């Protein structure tokens, strides 16, 4: 499926991100969008 | 680039790894070896 890279993201954000992926599998896709936006927002 | 996948690692483990990975970039290769060990250990 679609892939999302987190280069400019903050490590704490990554932990929170991975936590959200686990909280609800269906949300992972939506979380991927926001998470991906952070890479741009924190870029 | 060599790409690694850790689906077997729990969020706490990935968080621990990501913190250690970030805190010690010089040891990123060695630390990854452990996560790869985890990949097998959590297999």
């Amino acid at each position: 499926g679609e892939i999302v890279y987190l280069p400019n993201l903050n490590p704490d954000q990554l932990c929170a991100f991975i936590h959200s992926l686990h909280d609800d599998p269906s949300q992972s896709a939506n979380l991927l969008a926001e998470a991906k936006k952070l890479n741009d927002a924190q870029a | 680039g060599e790409i690694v996948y850790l689906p077997n690692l729990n969020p706490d483990q990935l968080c621990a790894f990501i913190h250690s990975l970030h805190d010690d970039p010089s040891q990123s290769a060695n630390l990854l070896a452990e996560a790869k060990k985890l990949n097998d250990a959590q297999a």
Partner: peptide, 25 residues
């Protein structure tokens, strides 16, 4: 360099946490 990324795999797994190691793929 190392990079953390999530792959959309659907299923009950949602996405998979994978990281890149060195340079660019």
């Amino acid at each position: 360099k190392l990079v953390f990324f999530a792959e959309d795999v659907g299923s009950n797994k949602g996405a998979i946490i994978g990281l890149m190691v060195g340079g660019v793929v």
